[PDB]
Design a binder for these strands. Structure first.
Ligand SMILES: [Zn+2]
Lengths: 63, 286, 135, 45, 37, 127
RNA sequence: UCUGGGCCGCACGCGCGCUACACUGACGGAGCCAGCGAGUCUAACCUUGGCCGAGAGGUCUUGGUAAUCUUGUGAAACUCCGUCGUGCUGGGGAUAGAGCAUUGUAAUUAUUGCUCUUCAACGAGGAAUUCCUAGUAAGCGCAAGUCAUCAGCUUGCGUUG
């Protein structure tokens, strides 16, 4: 079941604009720990860009 | 407060004098010494003075002398006592007292009869004390109108208990071996009682009575048997009732239905499968 | 860190030591479901065996389950010392043990009937309370 | 009659007749006061 | 105890003084405790 | 058993070796000291033990302290313990070790609440 | 005088409070800021520092009879970085058992502290009701009295506000 949710994260990230862990779990798809692992893998990838980082909230921008 | 052990210190002449005080205090504002001496119709000044001193040291009659005007003043406990004597003349109260539940305007004790059956009581202390006449008169009339409400609710086949008497503002009720849902935990046949508890709202509103404070603390559930678990639902919402002709009954009715569905979805986790009883069908039902 | 996802090979509801566990929460808090094992004891049991606890319990293999089960009955050999255990210096045999989910109730019933046949105040107080609030 | 009276003849002006259903059951360990025998065989209906 | 009036109630035990409060409230000025604020 | 130890060897060692097999409360109680009157208590205890008929119960030793740790030289003895008012004749069995004597001696009859007939009848008279 | 029990025993009502029902949060690391105080003799108080122990704490010494030492009371709430995702959950911590320590002559009706386990009700509370107009409400800890040991008791202090 891994490849289709790979496609869901790699499709959902270039659609909407502002990303946090709460916004990832408001896609009714993913858990919050896996939302952070997708956030850190996406920061290593480079589709999103950082704006502000904090341990509770972290907003991003689609690029 | 009320300490009921002290009225058996009194003789026959003492509550005869107390009956003279309550007879003379309902014609004028303050009754003096010679109206108690004359209205009582008893022989001596000495016995009147001894009975008045007996009520004074038991804090039942307050001595007041406001510049050459001797007079006496009834407190709460003396009129509680004489109401319980005229309840004793109606040969039913015999032995009184365990405080279970202290309300704002009505305090609940635990009484018995000559037969020894378990009963309770409802006193009415309006203002608790700057005693006049309006407080105790309003307590008396409130007790009277809730006695007619109580008899009318018991006479129409409801699960509302039996009244006996309305002796001034002292109201004597039957004890019910019942538990609230604070104590109650789980029941076998929850949809049958939910059917009974919407049917209670239906025939109250068909009678035209709207009980408003219909929280979890209202319902008292009697356990008649321990092997078959027979049940009875006792509802105490007597001063908060409103008539069907009032203008604000709509949010009262949906508040009652909303509270019973939220309390039965919270504790017992039971959901209503039929729809909620709405106001207009019950309005045409009365 | 890095996302690693696998096509299948995770189980929703598992069962270990005749007790049911669920494979979507982490290993420690799937092991809080069984009785007699809490959080800290399960942390110590799993962190002895070099188990990564950041990952979840759905990708637990059988060789991890067998070594956890092998930790359970004799923790004293593998540097899990005396003060972490529930059975400590018992009156029956004088050794130390960690009681399991079908053995906590045998321990509790053994303590209560032992207090009964001792006829201590604790025992007669507890059985009088049970026989009175039960009735 | 005065034989079957738990209290004195004051019931016209005093108490209620108090019922004392004495459920006496004997537990036998060898040598026991009334307190422990009262703690052993309490039955609530 | 309070060595003024045989007081077995209302003691203050600070500084090894053991006076009751109802005797301290009139002997405070002779000791040195004066009402300032 | 006490520590996995068979009982007949446990009957014949001294108090210090019981302390070496004791829990922490018993060792802390031993570590400060006793008064002299339990020596007379154990003297009259073994005096009543030595006059016992064979295969029967020994003479009762009426005890009164409720704070003493059980030390098993009185295995087989029967004692009557004061509660403050009366005596409870309790025999010592070897499975009650590590315990105070006062937990065999209750202090009150229990609080009864499931009796509505006796409660209703005894209210204060209102006349 | 001597012992032994209590005043805490529990269907319960009333009242003053504590902790919570959570993600402005629970947990793990790091940043770290106070003031009102108080402290021992013909005794043993406040305790610095070093060893042991998971800890509770023990032990060996030293300072202060005090703006000097505890103490700069490096307090907590807080700040950041990671774990948890709305699931009576990892919230909550009632109850209960086992062991180890400390005070007390004596701890059972468990004095108190530590370790593991048990993880109970309780999804912002009805009728009604308490207090309050600026460093003030509220949250938060600390000090002093009760002190032999613990506070949820009281009075003050300080932090954020
Ligand atoms: Zn004095």
């Amino acid at each position: 079941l891994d490849q289709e949710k790979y496609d869901r994260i790699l499709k959902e990230v270039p659609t909407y604009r502002y990303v946090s862990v709460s916004v990832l779990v408001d896609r009714l798809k993913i858990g919050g720990s896996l939302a952070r692992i997708a956030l850190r893998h996406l920061e290593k990838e480079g589709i999103i860009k950082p704006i502000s980082k904090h341990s509770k909230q972290a907003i991003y921008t689609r690029a | 407060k009320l300490d009921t052990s002290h009225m058996r210190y009194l003789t026959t002449d003492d509550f005869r004098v107390l009956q003279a005080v309550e007879q003379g205090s309902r014609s004028h504002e303050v009754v003096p010494t010679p109206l108690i001496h004359q209205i009582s119709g008893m022989r001596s000044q000495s016995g009147t003075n001894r009975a008045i001193s007996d009520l004074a040291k038991l804090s039942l009659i307050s001595k007041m002398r406001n510049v050459k005007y001797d007079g006496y003043r009834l407190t709460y406990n003396g009129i509680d006592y004489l109401a319980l004597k005229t309840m004793l003349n109606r040969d039913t109260v015999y032995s009184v007292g365990n405080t279970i539940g202290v309300g704002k305007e009505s305090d609940i004790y635990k009484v018995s009869d000559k037969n020894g059956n378990p009963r309770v009581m409802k006193i009415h202390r309006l203002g608790r004390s700057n005693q006049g006449a309006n407080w105790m008169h309003l307590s008396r009339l409130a007790a009277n109108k809730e006695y007619q409400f109580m008899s009318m609710l018991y006479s129409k086949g409801f699960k509302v208990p039996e009244p006996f008497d309305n002796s001034r503002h002292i109201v004597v009720m039957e004890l019910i071996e019942g538990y609230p849902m604070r104590r109650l935990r789980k029941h076998k046949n929850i949809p049958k009682l939910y059917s009974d508890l919407m049917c209670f709202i239906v025939d109250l509103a068909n009678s035209g009575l709207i009980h408003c404070d219909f929280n979890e603390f209202n319902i008292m559930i009697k356990d008649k048997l321990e092997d078959e678990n027979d049940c009875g639902f006792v509802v105490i919402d007597f001063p908060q009732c409103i008539s069907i002709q009032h203008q604000d009954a709509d949010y009262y009715f949906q508040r009652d239905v909303d509270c019973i569905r939220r309390f039965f979805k919270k504790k017992l986790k039971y959901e209503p499968k039929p729809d909620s009883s709405m106001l207009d069908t019950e309005g045409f039902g009365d | 860190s890095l996302v690693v996802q696998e096509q299948g090979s995770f189980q929703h509801i598992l069962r270990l030591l005749n007790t049911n566990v669920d494979g979507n929460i982490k290993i420690v808090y799937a092991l809080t479901t069984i009785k007699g094992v809490g959080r800290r004891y399960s942390n110590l049991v799993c962190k002895k065996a070099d188990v990564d606890l950041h990952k979840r319990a759905g990708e637990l293999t059988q060789e991890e389950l067998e070594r956890i089960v092998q930790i359970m009955q004799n923790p004293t050999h593998y540097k899990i010392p005396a003060w972490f255990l529930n059975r400590q210096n018992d009156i029956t045999d004088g050794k130390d043990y960690h009681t399991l989910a079908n053995n906590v109730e045998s321990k509790l019933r053994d303590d209560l009937e032992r207090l009964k046949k001792i006829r201590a105040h604790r025992g007669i107080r507890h059985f009088w309370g049970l026989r009175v609030r039960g009735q | 009659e005065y034989d079957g009276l738990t209290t004195a003849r004051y019931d016209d002006h005093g108490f209620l007749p108090g019922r004392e259903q004495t459920s006496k059951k004997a537990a036998v360990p060898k040598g026991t006061s009334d307190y422990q025998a009262k703690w052993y065989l309490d039955d609530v209906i | 105890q309070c060595r003024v009036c045989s007081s077995h109630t209302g003691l203050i035990r600070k500084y090894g003084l053991n006076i009751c409060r109802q005797c301290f409230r009139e002997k405070a000025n002779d000791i040195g405790f004066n009402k300032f604020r | 058993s006490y520590r996995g130890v068979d009982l007949e060897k446990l009957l014949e060692m001294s108090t210090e070796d019981f302390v070496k097999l004791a829990p922490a409360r018993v060792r802390r109680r031993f570590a400060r000291g006793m008064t002299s009157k339990p020596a007379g208590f154990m003297k009259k205890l073994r005096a009543a033990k030595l006059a016992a008929p064979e295969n029967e119960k020994p003479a009762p030793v009426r005890t009164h302290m409720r704070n003493m740790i059980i030390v098993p030289e009185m295995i087989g003895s029967v004692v009557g313990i004061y509660n403050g008012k009366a005596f409870n004749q309790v025999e010592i069995r070897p499975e009650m070790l590590g315990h105070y004597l006062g937990e065999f001696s209750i202090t009150y009859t229990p609080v009864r609440h499931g009796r509505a007939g006796a409660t209703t009848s005894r209210f204060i008279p209102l006349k």
